[PDB]
A paper describes a structure:
In our continued search for an open structure of xlσ1R, crystals with an appearance (cube-like) different from the xlσ1Rclosed-endo crystals (cuboid-like) were obtained and their structure was determined to 3.56 Å (xlσ1Ropen-endo). The xlσ1Ropen-endo structure was solved in the P212121 space group, with each asymmetric unit containing 12 protomers. Similar to all σ1R structures, xlσ1Ropen-endo also assembles as homotrimers. Each asymmetric unit contains four trimers, which are packed in a tetrahedron shape through the α1–α1 contacts. Structural comparison between xlσ1Ropen-endo and xlσ1Rclosed-endo shows that the two structures are very similar, with the exception of two regions. One region consists of the transmembrane helix α1, which swings ~18° away from the trimer center in xlσ1Ropen-endo compared to xlσ1Rclosed-endo. In xlσ1Ropen-endo, the α4 helix rotates slightly away from α5, and the side chain of Tyr203 from α5 adopts a gauche+ χ1 rotamer to point to the cupin-fold domain, thus creating an opening between α4 and α5 that generates a direct pathway for the ligand from the outside milieu to the ligand-binding site. Therefore, the xlσ1Ropen-endo structure may represent an open-like conformation for σ1R and is consistent with PATH2 that predicts the ligand entry between α4 and α5. Like xlσ1Rclosed-endo, the xlσ1Ropen-endo crystals were grown in the absence of any known ligand, but the xlσ1Ropen-endo structure also has an unidentifiable electron density within its ligand-binding pocket.
Author numbering:
A (entry chain A), B (entry chain B), C (entry chain C): -3 to 219
The structure:
Amino acid sequence: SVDTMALWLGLRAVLVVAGLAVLLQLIRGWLSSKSYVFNREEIARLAKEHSGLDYEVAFSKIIVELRKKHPGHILQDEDLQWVFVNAGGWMGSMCLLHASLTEYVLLFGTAVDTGGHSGRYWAEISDTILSGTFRQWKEGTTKSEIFYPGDTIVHEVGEATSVQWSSGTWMVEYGRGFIPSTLAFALADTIFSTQDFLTLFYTVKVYSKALLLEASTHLSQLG
Amino acid sequence: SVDTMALWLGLRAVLVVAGLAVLLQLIRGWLSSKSYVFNREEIARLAKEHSGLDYEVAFSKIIVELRKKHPGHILQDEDLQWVFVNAGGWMGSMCLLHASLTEYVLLFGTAVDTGGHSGRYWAEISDTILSGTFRQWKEGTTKSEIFYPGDTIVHEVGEATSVQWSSGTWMVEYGRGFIPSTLAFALADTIFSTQDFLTLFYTVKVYSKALLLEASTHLSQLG
Amino acid sequence: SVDTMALWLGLRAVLVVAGLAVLLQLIRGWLSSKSYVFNREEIARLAKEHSGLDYEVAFSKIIVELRKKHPGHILQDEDLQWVFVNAGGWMGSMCLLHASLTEYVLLFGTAVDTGGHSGRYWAEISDTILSGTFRQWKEGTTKSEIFYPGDTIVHEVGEATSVQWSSGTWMVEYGRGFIPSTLAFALADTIFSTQDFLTLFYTVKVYSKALLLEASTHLSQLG
């Protein structure tokens, strides 16, 4: 039974590889055939439309428009708060409006000069600048590009770049894909640098509120 | 007998929260009751007095004045050394003059442009700029404020901000509260980023020196 | 057996100290008597010679000259790729040309504004600027210095500094000493911040390619 004791070892690894491949293909097929509440072009155009005003007025108008076109998918004013985001070596702030297992919409930006690693996840993230500047340094190149209000950067799936923002840079962010892949990145600098677990609690609270809102909307649609 | 299973846990958690509340009340009352070697106004005025001259001359004059007004509570010239401080995503350097379990005084600053998370501890930290600029971004806002020589930033207890310092920014720092709460923060980037454990040794050394000086001064004053 | 058991601990600790000291002395004596493919002056002069041109033209000419003078010790064009480097709180990009256990040559630089801790390892690292600016802040001082194309920074063994690079700063890097000492540093920010394990894989790939090239060259010299 020495040959069969080794047959288990060989076949168990093949089974693990086949199961992981089947799970990845299943998730990819689900993501390709799923119905989405928002599309990235919608958010990008809505942001470019109000990018000419003050970024706070733009925030207000964009939130109003999002609640009008997609009722039941955006948090109310009593649940909106700015939460610090320390990640990839940079530090900014977010205001989450919607978040599911496959989509999230928020208002991002920083009042200080920061920059770092953009992350590399199984999701596509679009960023439309309302004010400020956004320097992107794509992988495998020696030159970066600066983007201004109105522009939209698309951090593609599986791509990793370097991001840099000047003081007062604010944008509207929409992420689509497998959102939990980002989660770990979003927490790294909080665990091994800032030690700001209170901000971690705030982040957990707002994400939980968005997920519960989406679940309650699904239940209301069913009854 | 099944009801007691969950009754053990349910009231026990309230008792645990009450016990930590009693510990917090004891520590909070001890801080107000405690007599303090320094007050933030004293350090702030002493630093602002010399904020108009060169930052090195200001360092020397402030150290001499502190040794004059509080003998036995400030390290001698043989114990002063600049130690790198990597924390919260920023990098500066410190020279510790005094440190107890509830107070610390030091000269902080950086010769490079840095910035990051300010930390969130159970202590109030006052910073009086001797030279340079200090950008502070408070939590929950979208705009930051720049402070110049003469100004004083008060990192309040439990609040977290974003700090940014330009090249050649130097200040006098006084912290009061529960000092060990900051400790972990002060080491995070050293453990998970810089790997400069020699600087960790230097920091532990100066902290131990200050604590031993404070203990010996207490023993000498008591007898 | 109290007297005997305390005897165990003392001799055990002395044995550990003596063994670690003998290992360190062995490695240092080996490093002092080893033949090296490159010297820092060679790389520094070769980079300063082409420091007047564009950093890409300089890269190509320097690679050509290095492959001409030292054939079989530098990877070919099919193995060269730019890999992101997140370390010490800064983010740049590298292109490795040569790497052994005691030497490494690469082209380093960043297209974004970054800076942080320089690291502290058992190796000397020379950096000859082809373009941009390099701000160095030495340990124990309150002033930094800016260096321009043509200059050479020598990150000495055991010294720790603060580095800062402007957008578009590119240089040629040569490191000599005990290379594994740097290893932890090179991965720290990747494990506890970026979570970009694909870039980790790329780094491992290029390091393995350079090491295998060196091993195959030694075998070819032997036969």
